[PDB]
Amino acid sequence: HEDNCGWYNFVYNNKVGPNAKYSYINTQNLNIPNVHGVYFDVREHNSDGVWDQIDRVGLLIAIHGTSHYSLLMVLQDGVEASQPHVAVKICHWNPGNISTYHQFDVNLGDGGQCVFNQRFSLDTVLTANDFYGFQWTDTYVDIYLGGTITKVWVVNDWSVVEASISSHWNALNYGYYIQFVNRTTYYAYNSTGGSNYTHLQLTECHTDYCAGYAKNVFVPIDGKIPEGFSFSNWFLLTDKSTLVQ
């Protein structure tokens, strides 16, 4: 899976990246793939994984803890259309389960407790495989749809992800990868001058706090900021007027 991680190198880390800089990226992401056509992928873990698909088949992901009473859940469909669109909703339901096999524009529950809704446009710009997953921690929900990262602050008491494919195809093959992450992996970005793999030199690390060396963290050796340090974020504090030179 070097090329598949090498495809993960290209599209997934082209979310934000500016030039000539390195950091210490930690996001719970892929390590080893899984292909599943069970169509009721009931799996309970501690964070989301990432899926991957090129063909024109609808998808549906549901995120919850247990069946709560006001703690909101996540509903989401990835449906093929004239443009393959995706809507994510944050609301609540007691009845039902995904053994469904219907059409799914907006189809799971009209919950009366619903606050967030957005119809995202999936940028299927590249012809290769591009990754789209999610993340939550405790109050803090992540979206990785298309070209950006969007954040939702609600609450996360979430340990059961519900994924399913709702169609009875007779015998088809699916180039189709989906993982489920319950890990705390770390990485080490580079992009010094360009290692020409595409632009960078990745490094996964084994245990903890690797050779990434974020320049924001320092050691206050005497109560003193170290010399030779970027003050891009420390300011002169005043109230009358700032200086210029």
Ligand X SMILES: *[C@@H]1O[C@H](CO)[C@@H](O[C@@H]2O[C@H](CO)[C@@H](O)[C@H](O)[C@H]2NC(C)=O)[C@H](O)[C@H]1NC(C)=O
Ligand Y SMILES: *[C@@H]1O[C@H](CO)[C@@H](O[C@@H]2O[C@H](CO)[C@@H](O[C@@H]3O[C@H](CO)[C@@H](O)[C@H](O)[C@@H]3O)[C@H](O)[C@H]2NC(C)=O)[C@H](O)[C@H]1NC(C)=O
42 versus 126: smaller Cβ distance to ligand X: 42
Lookup: tokens for 2: 């070097």
Nearest to 175, CA basis, from 83, 52, 79: 52
Q: What angle do CA 28, 114, 164 make, to 5 degrees?
A: 50
Lookup: tokens for 159: 């340990």
User: In this chain, which stretch among 34-42, 92-100, 169-177, 189-197 interacts with ligand NAG, using CB under 6 A?
Assistant: 189-197
For 231, the 3-state DSSP assignment is coil
3 versus 157: smaller Cβ distance to ligand Y: 157
Least Cβ distance, residue 182 to ligand Y (angstroms): 3
User: How is residue 239 annotated by DSSP?
Assistant: S
For residue 172, the tally of other CB atoms under 10 A from its CB is 9
Choose from ligand Y, other proteins, ligand X, none: what does 40 bind? Cβ within 5-8 Å by kind. ligand X
User: In this chain, which stretch among 29-37, 38-46, 130-138, 146-154 interacts with ligand Y, using CB under 6 A?
Assistant: 38-46
Choose from other proteins, ligand Y, ligand NAG, none: what does 183 bind? Cβ within 5-8 Å by kind. ligand Y
- Distance between CA atoms of 126 and 54, rounded to whole angstroms? 10
- Distance between CA atoms of 159 and 103, rounded to whole angstroms? 27
For residue 229, the tally of other CB atoms under 10 A from its CB is 11
Of 19, 196, 216, 245, the one binding ligand NAG (CB under 6 A) is: 196
For 62, the 3-state DSSP assignment is strand
26 versus 97: smaller Cβ distance to other proteins: 26
Of 194, 204, 215, 218, the one binding ligand NAG (CB under 6 A) is: 194
- Which amino acid, one-letter code, is at 139? T
- Distance between CA atoms of 215 and 227, rounded to whole angstroms? 12
**Which residues, numbered 80-109, are part of the site for other proteins (CB under 8 A)?**
90
User: Interface residues with other proteins (CB under 8 A)?
Assistant: 15-16, 23-25, 27, 90, 115-116, 139-140, 149-154, 189, 212, 214, 216-217, 223-225, 227, 229, 231-239, 241-245
User: Interface residues with ligand Y (CB under 6 A)?
Assistant: 44-46, 182-183
User: Interface residues with ligand X (CB under 6 A)?
Assistant: 22, 40, 42, 97, 99, 190, 192-193, 195, 201, 211, 213
